[PDB]
Amino acid sequence: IVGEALEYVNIGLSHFLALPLAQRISLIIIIPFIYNIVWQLLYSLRKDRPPLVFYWIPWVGSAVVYGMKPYEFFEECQKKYGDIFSFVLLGRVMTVYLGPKGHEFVFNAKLADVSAEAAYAHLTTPVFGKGVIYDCPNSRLMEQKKFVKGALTKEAFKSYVPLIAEEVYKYFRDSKNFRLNERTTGTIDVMVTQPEMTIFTASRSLLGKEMRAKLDTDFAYLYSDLDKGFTPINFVFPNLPLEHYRKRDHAQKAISGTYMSLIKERRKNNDIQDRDLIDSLMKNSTYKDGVKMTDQEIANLLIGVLMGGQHTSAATSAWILLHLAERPDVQQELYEEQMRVLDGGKKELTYDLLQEMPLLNQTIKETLRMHHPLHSLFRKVMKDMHVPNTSYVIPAGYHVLVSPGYTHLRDEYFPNAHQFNIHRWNNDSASSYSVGEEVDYGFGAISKGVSSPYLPFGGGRHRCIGEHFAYCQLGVLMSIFIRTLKWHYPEGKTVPPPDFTSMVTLPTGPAKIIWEKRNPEQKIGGRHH
Ligand code: HEM
Ligand SMILES: O[C@](Cc1ccccc1Cl)(Cn1cncn1)C1(Cl)CC1
């Protein structure tokens, strides 16, 4: 009968629970291994799902290959499966949609369909603090971006340019990496100098002289502490009780405390001007429902703004230096533009004159094409998503992944994509531009279409608002580098490959260049010890 088989189910169960633990832990790995494999083969039979990349190790998925070489990973998947495909990543299912259609499917997705803050809050909230960026409803984000943008105006950039210039010259004068008054040539690691120059120039201009002054003290170590807490590791283990995580948390409290100290001091003195982003957020951080940002939230939002601009910009100036190091022809061409626009150095650099340096701006544009700082952008899917002109459905709980930086490197959209060529942007020197209709999500009119193959600043509701600041900063910095120095590689060295494991696609260090003064006898004035 069949009842006697049912007895043997029970018997077999009892014999299973009595196996030697050698065989039993052997089975606790062999069962999920086999089940994973069986599940994938079953999955490939669904026609309402994008092809899923095969993987051996459950939960881990394609994490290794994706983690180390994501563009190579995407190209292989693209050849095998086309532009839409899925892969497992440390517990999650990522659906990749490559190319301009993918830009459109993700950046222009319905607010109800996808969530950025659901993807990122665990990465950023620990670092920035509560109440801001991804620790708040999207509508709050939209207004925060409006608040920050309102400090990032043309009139602010006119005032930031000499402050940024002052910092670059102070760095050339005082830093051990240069000391131009004492040395006429030297070797630097751009992954040491550019992060420093970046935080010095961004602090001075966006936070002001007090906050810049504090980076000359041991307080600077908190920034370094806070900086470590910004790592992909936060995606799997956002909070685990080790030391790294406590120095981070301490840094957040300590730095936000310093900003709040200055904010409350400015208000108690009625010392509220138009100097910096701090003045600006103090005068302009009331939401449309009338709720005012707290001083804590203002401080946290300052941290997020500085942190965002820090890693994107520092990686970008590093790459610019690295590409130009093997292109003395491009340095020469940029130097001639500087001499023409600044009347042989006699004109002081201003924001308006920066806008008349198309080749310098094209050099930034081309670096951002070859080295998009963020190789992958994510959203969590909130509701089932039908993929147009397919029968594909992306179910809620999945994640979508868009990669404009991958398209940046495709010969079909950029001929000879792997060649650094600033002249591919001749008569097209703008950081970005909308080829047509606009829309406003709450922080200004931006392009409605997100189909450009070039999208260094993303698009849609989550689009960057830092692009003009980053061009101002990079522009001032590279204008001074060009006028002051020539540089090249040590023998046999060339452009390093990207390190894709970090949060930005920074160069693999150490990435060293050799500088020499164009004018060995030129002195940088000012007092120093
Ligand atoms: C070369 C420099 C930069 C590049 C290439 C860059 C790139 C991007 C990209 C691709 C996004 C969209 C992210 C997504 O869709 O998930 C973004 C968003 C954003 N960025 Fe930047 N960024 C840069 C610098 C900056 C700077 C300097 C600031 C501030 C001064 C900044 C602040 C922001 C903010 C507030 C968002 C909005 C995020 C959201 O709404 O979800 N970024 N950036
Ligand atoms: O978009 C960011 C997050 C981010 C967004 C706004 C402000 C700061 C940060 Cl760090 C990075 N970023 C974007 N612009 C500046 N930083 C990443 Cl790390 C990709 C998810």
Q: Tell which atom from ligand 2 comes closest to the C-alpha of 304.
A: 8
Q: Report d(CA 481, CA 190) in Å as an integer.
A: 13
Q: How far is the CA of 457 from the centre of ligand 1 (A)?
A: 6
Which technique was used to obtain these atomic coordinates? X-ray
Question: For the sheet containing 377-381, what is the strand order?
Answer: 84-89, 92-97, 399-402, 377-381, 114-115
* Rounded-to-integer distance, Cα 187 and Cα 280, Å: 40
Ligand closest to Cα of 464 equals 1
Burial class (CB in 10 A: 0-12, 13-18, 19+), 344: exposed
Please give the distance, rounded to the nearest whole angstrom, from the Cα atom of residue 508 to the centre of ligand 2. Answer: 21
Strand boundaries in 143-285, DSSP class E: 185-189
Cα 118 to Cα 110: distance, rounded to the nearest angstrom: 15
Residue 308 Cα to ligand 2 midpoint, Å, equals 5
Compute the distance between CA of residue 194 and CA of residue 192 in angstroms, rounded to an integer. 6
Cβ density class 117-133: b for 16+ within 10 Å, e for less: bebbbbbbbbbbbebbb
Beta strands, E only, 264-415: 377-381, 385-386, 393-394, 399-402
Q: Which of 129, 134, 132 is nearest to 116 (CA)?
A: 134
DSSP state of 178: -
Enter the CATH code of domain 121-517: 1.10.630.10
Q: What is the resolution of this structure in A?
A: 2.1
Angle between helices 467-484 and 358-370 (to 10 degrees): 110
Cβ contact 115:380 at 8 Å: yes
Q: Ligand 2: which residue has its CA nearest to atom 14?
A: 308
Nearest Cα to 195, choosing from 146, 151, 159, 230? 230
For ligand 2, atom 13: residue with the closest CA: 308
Q: Provide the b/e sequence for 219-240 (b: ≥16 CB within 10 Å).
A: eeebbebbbebbeeebbeeeee
Check: CB of residue 408 under 8 Å from CB of residue 374. Answer: no
Ligand 2 pocket test, candidate residues 115, 133, 316, most atoms within 8 A of CB: 133
Buried b (16+ CB within 10 A) or exposed e, 2-33: eeeeeeeeeeeeeeeeeeeeeeeeeeeeeeee
Residues lining ligand 1, CB < 6 A?
A: 116, 141, 145, 305, 308-309, 312-313, 316, 368, 373-374, 377, 456-458, 462-466, 469-470
